[PDB]
C-alpha cells in the first residue's frame, strides 16, 4: 500500500461522503468529516481546519457560480470577520497557555472572565511598569494595555469595562469607543471617525506609550 | 548644621541658607587626632544625625504576632527618606568633604569611621525596603508556611539585627526565597516581584536567586496550566533553561522540589538532565 496513516484515514472519510452522495443522502459537512481525522494527528493539522471551517463558515447563496461568490462585496466583506474572529480566538488561547501550562489545568480551575485572564497575562509579559506608559493605571495595570488585549482576545465588552473605570483618565475617548462597539464592522461614522482620527494625528502621531497608538 | 544642609527646617533663600550650612559643616568640622584616636566632630555629627533618625526603629521588634508591623508603615517612609537624603548629600560632596574621599593614622580611621557609618545607611534603607515590601504581601500567610525556628527568629528580631547583624541577613534571604514561592501562588506577576528585589535591595538579594525564581515560576505555573497539554512542554522546556543557567549555584533543598514537581509532570528525562547538569557545575574540574 502507497497510504501513509493520515492519508489512508482521509480516504475512509472520502468514502463516506462518496457512499452518502451514492446513496443519495444527505450532503454531510466535508470540513467536518476531514477534521475527523486530523485530531489524529498533532495540533498543527487541527488548528488549521479550524481555520477552514471558520473561514468557510459564511452565508452563501446556494446553486450559484463560484466567482460570483468570491467577487461579491457581500461575502469579501464577511471573510474579514470570520478571520478576526479566529485571529483574536487563537490569541485569546495563547493567553490561556500563556497564564495556565496547559488548556485543561485551564479548564479545572475554569477559564476566567477575558478581563481577569487578560489581566493575569499583563502580570507575566510586562512584570516590571515600562516609564512610557500613559493615563496611569487600573487596578494594577496601563489602562491601555487592557484595552488593546481585550480588543486582542476580541472582548469588546471587557475593553468597555475597562473604559467605565478610567472615565475621567481617558477624556473624550469613552464616547468614542462606546460608538465602535455599537457600530457594526467595526467602523465609526465618518463625523466621529474624523474627529478622533484628526487629533490622534495632530499631537499624538509618536506618543510614549504605543498600546495607546495600536488602540 | 548637616540637618539643615540637608533639608531640616526647610518645611517652614532656602539654597542659600542650606548651602552656608553646607559650608559650615566643611569649615568647623574639625580634625581626627592621636589622643586610640579622636575621631572629628564631623564625623560625630553624622553619627548623631544618623541616630536620632532612627532612634524610633533600632530597638524595636521589626514585627508584632495575625502578623503585623510594629512602626507604620508612613513611619518607615519618612525614615528612609531622611536617611536616603543624607546618604544623597554625601555623595554630592564627596570631593568637598574632609574624610569621605581616600586619603596619616589619624586621617586613615577618619576615613574608615566615615566609611563604615555610610554602609550602615544604604543597610538601613535596604533593611527597610526589605520590611515594606514583606508586608505588601501576606505575611500571616507567609509565617504561616514556615518552620518554627524561623518564627521564632522572626518573633524578636530587632532593627538593629536586620541591620547590621548577619542573623538578620541570613533570615531577610530566608523571607525573600519564601515570599516569591507565595507570590507565585497568588501568581499575579513573577518578573515585576523580580526587577522590585532585583535593585533596591541588591547586596541582599543575589541574581542568581531571582533567575531561580523565574524557573520556579514556570514549573508552578506548569503545575497550574498542567491540564493542558501543549502549553506545559514550553513551560517546563524553559523552566529547565533557567535551572541550568544557575545550575553551579542550586541549593540541594530547591533541586529536589524541581525535580517532585518534574515528577507530577511526567517530565522524567527531563529532571534527569537537570540533575547531571547541577553535578558538572559543582564540580568542572572533574
Not at chain 1, 87 to 103: C, D, R
Not at chain 1, 182 to 205: F, G, I, M, Q, V
Not at chain 2, 31 to 55: E, F, G, I, W
Request: hydrophobic letters at 40%; a neutral charge.
Amino acid at each position: 500500500s502507497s497510504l501513509d496513516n493520515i492519508e489512508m484515514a482521509y480516504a475512509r472519510q472520502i468514502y463516506i461522503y462518496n457512499e452518502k452522495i451514492v446513496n443519495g443522502h444527505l450532503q454531510p459537512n466535508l470540513v467536518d468529516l476531514c477534521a475527523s481525522v486530523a485530531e489524529l494527528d498533532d495540533k498543527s493539522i487541527s488548528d488549521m481546519w479550524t481555520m477552514v471551517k471558520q473561514m468557510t463558515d459564511v452565508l452563501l447563496t446556494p446553486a450559484t457560480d463560484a466567482l460570483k461568490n468570491r467577487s461579491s462585496v457581500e461575502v469579501r466583506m464577511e471573510f474579514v470577520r470570520q478571520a478576526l474572529a479566529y485571529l483574536e480566538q487563537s490569541y485569546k488561547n495563547y493567553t490561556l497557555v500563556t497564564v495556565f501550562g496547559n488548556l485543561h489545568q485551564a479548564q479545572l480551575g475554569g477559564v476566567p472572565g477575558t478581563y481577569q485572564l487578560v489581566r493575569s497575562f499583563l502580570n507575566i509579559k510586562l512584570p516590571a511598569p515600562l516609564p512610557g506608559l500613559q493615563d496611569g493605571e487600573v487596578e494594577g495595570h496601563p489602562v491601555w494595555a487592557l484595552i488593546y488585549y481585550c480588543m486582542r482576545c476580541g472582548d469588546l465588552l471587557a475593553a468597555s469595562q475597562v473604559v467605565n473605570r478610567a472615565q475621567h483618565q481617558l477624556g473624550e475617548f469613552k464616547t468614542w469607543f462606546q460608538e465602535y462597539m455599537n457600530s457594526k464592522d467595526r467602523r465609526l461614522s465618518p463625523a466621529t471617525e474624523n474627529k478622533l482620527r484628526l487629533h490622534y494625528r495632530r499631537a499624538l502621531r509618536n506618543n510614549t506609550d504605543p498600546y495607546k497608538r495600536a488602540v | 548644621a548637616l540637618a539643615v544642609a540637608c533639608g531640616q527646617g526647610s518645611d517652614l533663600m532656602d539654597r542659600n541658607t542650606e548651602n552656608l550650612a553646607r559650608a559650615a559643616f566643611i569649615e568647623y568640622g574639625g580634625q581626627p587626632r592621636l589622643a586610640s584616636v579622636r575621631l572629628s566632630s564631623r564625623h560625630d555629627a553624622l553619627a548623631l544625625y544618623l541616630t536620632r533618625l532612627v532612634r524610633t526603629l533600632w530597638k524595636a521588634k521589626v514585627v508584632q504576632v495575625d502578623i503585623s508591623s510594629t512602626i507604620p508603615t508612613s513611619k518607615l517612609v519618612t525614615i528612609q527618606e531622611n536617611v536616603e537624603r543624607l546618604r544623597n548629600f554625601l555623595e554630592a560632596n564627596k570631593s568637598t568633604i574632609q574624610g569621605l574621599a581616600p586619603p596619616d593614622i589619624a586621617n586613615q580611621k577618619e576615613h574608615q569611621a566615615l566609611h563604615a557609618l555610610q554602609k550602615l545607611m544604604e543597610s538601613i534603607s535596604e533593611g527597610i525596603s526589605f520590611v515594606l515590601m514583606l508586608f505588601d504581601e501576606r505575611v500571616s500567610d507567609i509565617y504561616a508556611r514556615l518552620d518554627a525556628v524561623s518564627q521564632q527568629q522572626l518573633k524578636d528580631l530587632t532593627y538593629e539585627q536586620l541591620f547590621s547583624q548577619t542573623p538578620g541577613k541570613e533570615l531577610a534571604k530566608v523571607l525573600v526565597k519564601a515570599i516569591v514561592n507565595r507570590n507565585i501562588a497568588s501568581g499575579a506577576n513573577v518578573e515585576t516581584v523580580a526587577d522590585a528585589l532585583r535593585r533596591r535591595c541588591g547586596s541582599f538579594c543575589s541574581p542568581d536567586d531571582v533567575v531561580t525564581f523565574k524557573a520556579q515560576e514556570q514549573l508552578q505555573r506548569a503545575s497550574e496550566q498542567a491540564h493542558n497539554s501543549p502549553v506545559l512542554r514550553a513551560l517546563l522546556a524553559e523552566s529547565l533553561r533557567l535551572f541550568e543557567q544557575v545550575a553551579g549555584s542550586l541549593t540541594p533543598a530547591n533541586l529536589t522540589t524541581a525535580v517532585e514537581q518534574y515528577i507530577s509532570l511526567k517530565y522524567y528525562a527531563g529532571a534527569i538532565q537537570l540533575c547531571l547538569t547541577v553535578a558538572q557545575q559543582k564540580d568542572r574540574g572533574n
